[PDB]
Design a protein around this ligand. Structure first.
Ligand code: MG
Ligand code: MG
Ligand code: MG
Ligand code: MG
Ligand code: MG
Ligand code: MG
Ligand code: MG
Ligand code: MG
Ligand code: MG
Ligand code: MG
Ligand code: MG
Ligand code: MG
Ligand code: MG
Ligand code: MG
Ligand code: MG
Ligand code: MG
Ligand code: MG
Ligand code: MG
Ligand code: MG
Ligand code: MG
Ligand code: MG
Ligand code: MG
Ligand code: MG
Ligand code: MG
Ligand code: MG
Lengths: 173, 226, 156
RNA sequence: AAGGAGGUAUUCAUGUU
RNA sequence: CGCGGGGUGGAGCAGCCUGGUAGCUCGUCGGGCUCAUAACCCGAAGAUCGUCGGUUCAAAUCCGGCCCCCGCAACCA
RNA sequence: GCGGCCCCCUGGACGAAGACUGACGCUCAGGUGCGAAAGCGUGGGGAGCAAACAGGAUUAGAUACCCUGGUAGUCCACGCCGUAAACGAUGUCGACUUGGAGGUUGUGCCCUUGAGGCGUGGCUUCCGGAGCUAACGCGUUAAGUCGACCGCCUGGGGAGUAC
RNA sequence: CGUAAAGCGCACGCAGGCGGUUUGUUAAGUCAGAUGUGAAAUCCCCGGGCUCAACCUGGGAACUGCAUCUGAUACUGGCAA
């Protein structure tokens, strides 16, 4: 039957969004020794390095037929390449987990590695946080260089993720 | 066997390149531009696809030697698979400049490949003072990689099915020079002037490539079997 | 069956570090008389090899020309790099009146009666190419009637 | 003057300085 | 010996006239084809153009010599 | 050709919406005007720079390059001169012919979802298709396809010289 | 006529050249026909006479023009809206 191309493309457009930056899940067609090929249904399949897919333990928890959610860099790189980066999705999920952990205030870690305006600053896999000048540690600690260079093991209280800021505080933990 | 329009949409044929790299000769085969990316009008694609299939069936019935040209790393394995499925010839790796026009030199290369493979396997002389054995094996492997598909073609092909006309422009030019029907799938950035049976569609997607190859393989198999 | 004739042989130089390296270029034209004509241009260190290469090239890349009783169908102009060429369908019995390279090309093509003149440059290579192009850009009464959607009697 | 990095180059909280 | 004609992959044939381009069929091999043969299709191999020369930028082609082959040539008691 | 800021006088261009006149248009030989720099006349001004000139060097020579000085001039007012690689080495006007990336200046719409999205003009830089070109290259700002008018060329020197 | 010779340094502008679109009218340009003339010789065509030819010669055609008259009104021009 003559269901027009315009009307059919309308439904297909409604199914999938082409906005850059957003995250959509794609079936992994195959894995080579250093790259993973992911089909998200766009113009073409993406070729993401396996190091990105490699887990914290240097292993490939991913597999054929697995579904994982990948952030959309662009529809085309100029060579018909649907550039997709799942580590951006990892960063977005980490910001969401950081927001949850700064709302729930549970135990968490992350290498406190820099100097904030108030004091020392923390970095934790997508969480750029602060431990202030007098609040780097509870006591009068010169361990802002422990809050700049050593992992803070605490909760987060106040965070502005859009500002790339959190409070990796000298809290109860 | 034809392909349904919903299947084409699922494959992702409608998608094209960005609206800055488009070729103005592909303007008729364009529906719209969503987010600075061209949308190919499948309303023209479906009838043209079936027309190209009919011509391919005619050639296959007349026992023509089809050549499947595809060099994109996405389409290399699929082109080889389709050509072997339909017992035809393919070029999965880089198209040698003047593969068809300089057939007299390609013929000598084929003979060299045949001699090397025959001696290595059938002749099985084994002991070749190491260094020569490694060199001969490496040369045979390279020749198999380059010309393994077309080694049994004998003469010139009667039809050239080409993936991504823009990428394989050289092969299209040689086919035009010699005189050969070309069945090329043309994205928005490609130039359809050299193609005889244009098939508007996305050459990049492996889904679309597999869809195209399956349809044409079925058609040529029907034509040959008769 | 294919009548062929050599128009011009020219000596050229390359001027390499050692000295000057000379080589020969051959311009040839072949044709079947019945209407097909094709030119060839070849180059080799020696004259016989150059002529043979030119003959092979000329044998390839032929073009058909619509001939009307051994002459042209209408006055036709032809242009190229320097060569501007005019050719006229003269009456039977006049013979081929043309200058040099045009004479050779028309004779092998099979036109027996034309009035031609070469304006501009008369460089053999360019004038041969221009003459062949002009012959190509010449339609017959059947062709014009078909393209215009009429009968030959309506066109006359 | 020599070497390294990033880009066509900057957004990169102000504060601090 | 007289005159004429001829000699082109193994065989049978074009190409000679107009000097440039070695073709067609059978046969051989391989593959496909056929269960196989056969038939059919696709490839691959095979002459240095009888030979010796001459001419020419270039000769199966033009010219000559020689070699042969064939036809015609008047002679057997 | 124009470059600090402010004021006075003044020309042109472009956009929006309309209203108006109703071919009032285009080009232009002679003619008229404007026209960098250097130069000339009269009168001022004169810091810096700087032909000429002076001296010190360099060099076989150095009537130069280099260095120390330095007058016309460079600046102002009013006249004259009327020439430049005054160049996009591309006369002016108009029409038509695939595209891309920018800049600059208007303006319409879309939720300005906040710096945005989609249009629609003017001028401007680069890349490139057909086409054209001797080639180099030009390519909607043409050197493409055409129409109107004007200027100019006819081998190199002699010579943009003589009368 | 960008680089081979050739776009005035640039503008304004008289004479001059060119003129968007519709209708009417005129018939100047334009076109058609006719008449007069465009000397003869020469040129060309068909013939004829010198034994042939050159040469001579009969008839035609031509002399692309100009003038007058009668028509046509698509375009250009004039006039009117
Ligand atoms: Mg000339
Ligand atoms: Mg003037
Ligand atoms: Mg001055
Ligand atoms: Mg003065
Ligand atoms: Mg003074
Ligand atoms: Mg000085
Ligand atoms: Mg001084
Ligand atoms: Mg001048
Ligand atoms: Mg200037
Ligand atoms: Mg000039
Ligand atoms: Mg003017
Ligand atoms: Mg360009
Ligand atoms: Mg003078
Ligand atoms: Mg002068
Ligand atoms: Mg010059
Ligand atoms: Mg010049
Ligand atoms: Mg100028
Ligand atoms: Mg008018
Ligand atoms: Mg007038
Ligand atoms: Mg009149
Ligand atoms: Mg007379
Ligand atoms: Mg007589
Ligand atoms: Mg007479
Ligand atoms: Mg009138
Ligand atoms: Mg009128």
């Amino acid at each position: 039957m003559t269901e027009s191309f315009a009307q059919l493309f309308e439904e297909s457009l409604k199914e999938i969004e082409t906005r850059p930056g957003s995250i959509v899940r794609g079936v992994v067609v195959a894995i080579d020794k250093d790259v993973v090929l992911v089909d998200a249904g766009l113009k073409s399949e993406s070729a993401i390095p396996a190091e990105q897919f490699k887990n914290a333990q240097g292993e490939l928890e991913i597999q054929v037929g697995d579904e994982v959610d990948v952030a959309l860099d662009a529809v085309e790189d100029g060579f018909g390449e649907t550039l997709l980066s799942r580590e951006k999705a990892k960063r977005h999920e980490a910001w969401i987990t950081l927001e949850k952990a700064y709302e729930d205030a549970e135990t968490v870690t992350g290498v406190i590695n820099g100097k904030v305006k108030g004091g020392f600053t923390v970095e934790l896999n997508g969480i750029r946080a602060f431990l202030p000048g007098s609040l780097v540690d509870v006591r009068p600690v010169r361990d802002t260089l422990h809050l700049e260079g050593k992992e803070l093991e605490f909760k987060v209280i106040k965070l502005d993720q859009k500002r790339n800021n959190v409070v990796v505080s000298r809290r109860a933990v | 066997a034809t392909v349904s329009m919903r299947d084409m949409l699922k494959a992702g044929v409608h998608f094209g390149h960005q609206t800055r790299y488009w070729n103005p000769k592909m303007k008729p085969f364009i529906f719209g531009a969503r987010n600075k990316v061209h949308i190919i009008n499948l309303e023209k694609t479906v009838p043209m696809f079936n027309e190209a299939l009919a011509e391919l069936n005619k050639i296959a019935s007349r026992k023509g030697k089809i050549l499947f040209v595809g060099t994109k790393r996405a389409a290399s394995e699929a082109v080889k698979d389709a050509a072997l499925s339909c017992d035809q010839f393919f070029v999965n790796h880089r198209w040698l400049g003047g593969m068809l026009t300089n057939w007299k030199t390609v013929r000598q290369s084929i003979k060299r490949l045949k001699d090397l493979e025959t001696q290595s396997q059938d002749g099985t002389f084994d002991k070749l003072t190491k260094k020569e054995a490694l060199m001969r094996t490496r040369e045979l492997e390279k020749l198999e990689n380059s010309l393994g598909g077309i080694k049994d073609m004998g003469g010139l092909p009667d039809a050239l099915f080409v993936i991504d006309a823009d990428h394989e422009h050289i092969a299209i030019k040689e086919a035009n020079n010699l005189g050969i029907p070309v069945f090329a799938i043309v994205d928005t950035n490609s130039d359809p002037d050299g193609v005889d049976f244009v098939i508007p569609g996305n050459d990049d997607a492996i889904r679309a490539v597999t869809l195209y190859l399956g349809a044409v393989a079925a058609t040529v198999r029907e034509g040959r079997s008769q | 069956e294919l009548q062929e004739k050599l128009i011009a042989v020219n000596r050229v130089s390359k001027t390499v570090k050692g000295g000057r390296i000379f080589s020969f270029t051959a311009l040839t034209v072949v044709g079947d008389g019945n209407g097909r004509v094709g030119f060839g241009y070849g180059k080799a260190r020696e004259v016989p090899a150059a002529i043979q290469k030119a003959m092979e090239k000329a044998r390839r890349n032929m073009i058909n020309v619509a001939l009307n009783n051994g002459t042209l169908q209408h006055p036709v102009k032809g242009v190229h790099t320097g060569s501007r060429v005019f050719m006229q369908p003269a009456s039977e019995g006049t013979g081929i009146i043309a200058g040099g390279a045009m004479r050779a090309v028309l004779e092998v093509a099979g036109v027996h009666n034309v009035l031609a003149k070469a304006y501009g440059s008369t460089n053999p290579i360019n004038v041969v190419r221009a003459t062949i192009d002009g012959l190509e850009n010449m339609n017959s009464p059947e062709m014009v009637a078909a393209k215009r959607g009429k009968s030959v009697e309506e066109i006359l």
